[model samples]
Target: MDGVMSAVTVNDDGLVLRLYIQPKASRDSIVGLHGDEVKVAITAPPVDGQANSHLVKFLGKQFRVAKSQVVIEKGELGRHKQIKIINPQQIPPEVAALINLEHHHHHH
Candidate 1:
């Protein structure tokens, strides 16, 4: 979903997210948005599922959600990934704002 808007799974309390990941980066952080995907950087190399595990933990810390709530729905072994956010209410506004900013930048 290149150049797609942020597709949010909205609930009564908050919103769930489907994030696209990029692994084996120099650093770990939310780089920006691409199309409908969220570009994330991870320091962990793609080996033995270490990168995936790092991703879950990193995202849990970043979004302030429990590790158990973050799940990799798709793209486990590829550079592109689909992540599910179980509880959107726990995500901070700054994170959402950053995502929105990146989305607008890429889409506009």
Candidate 2:
């Protein structure tokens, strides 16, 4: 088995992150991984697209990219979503640590 335990995948442009969001949280933050997807808690409730826009803004700050660079590719109306980060200026330590985890867990 590949055993690629990662929530974010490298792509041609940048990264594709699978996110499991918990809306209406006290604050916005990236919680650890949920299965193969990253768990994110957002302050805005999932109503009238507020949470979606806020998620983009939060990730933009986390990745050191513009809000436009963070695109919600799928699951716009659900808790599970796929986001595309285009040309990130910086990689958050949370994601960067995944590299170490990958090598450590690979048995081959």
Candidate 3:
């Protein structure tokens, strides 16, 4: 319960979205939840923060906001990360749901 609840939250800054990035995958996607963090896949290799940059770009477009708003709050070097999309209009469809039917993305 805590895991699911902690996955997404709001604060004075904006929506605090938590995620676990799976880099060097087949493609870029929001797979599902990993523990309390939402599991995401990225195509970028883990080199000189390339994966992190890609995640920010991916999240900005996913939430329909500018890249500046998507701030990497934590876990810059680890798989786990905390992202704050400064007062997002709304959570992305993929992030808002437990399972995405459109892409058939789910947790194992």
Candidate 4:
């Protein structure tokens, strides 16, 4: 109903997100979850960290947080990545809703 599941655990101190990325897609968007990680598709190719940059920008926009708040904590040049989200307050309502949904969904 809301949308595809793309939720991750929140750790306000150091919220690390595991991402599975698809580079050079038609558009940039959060596609869904891949195993225990979130799957994101970006139009930018995986060149010169372009895909990583696009990923950070996409996350910043989606979470309503500043670009400075999102950082690639690990997997800088890999399709699988670990990203840190610094601002919990600015996360969009829908995104939070999805997190809650995922928590409940996993329980059932």
> How many clashes (backbone N, Cα, C below 3 Å) per candidate?
3, 0, 0, 0
lDDT of each: 0.65, 0.76, 0.72, 0.67
Candidate 1 per-residue lDDT over residues 1-108, each given as its tens digit: 455466455555444555656666788777776545567777887683788778777668777777667666666777766566676536655446644553444553
Superior candidate under TM-score, 1 versus 2: 2
Error of 2 at 82 (Å): 1.0
Better of 3 and 4 by TM-score: 3
The superposed Cα distance between candidate 1 and the true structure at residue 95, in angstroms, equals 4.9
**Model 3 CA lDDT for position 47:** 70
TM-score of each: 0.64, 0.78, 0.73, 0.68
Q: What is candidate 2's lDDT per residue for 10-106, written digit by digit as tens?
A: 8889887777888887888676565556887788876837987787777787787887778888768888878898988888767776654645555
Scored by Cα lDDT, where does model 2 land?
A: 0.76
lDDT of 4 at 10: 72
Query: How would you encode candidate 3's per-residue C-alpha lDDT over 55-106 as one tens digit per residue?
Result: 7777777787767888778868888778888868656665556434354557
Over 4 Å off in model 1, which ranges?
Answer: 1-4, 11-14, 98-108
Model 3 has an lDDT value of 0.72
lDDT of 4: 0.67
User: What is the C-alpha lDDT profile of model 4 across 1-108, one tens digit per residue?
Assistant: 255544355785746566677788788777765444467777987694677677777777767676777777766777777777886546654445646454544453
> Which segments of candidate 4 are over 4 A away from where they belong?
1-7, 92-98, 101-108
TM-score leaderboard ranking: 2, 3, 4, 1
After superposition on all C-alphas, the RMSD of every candidate to the true structure, in Å, is 5.6, 3.7, 6.9, 6.1
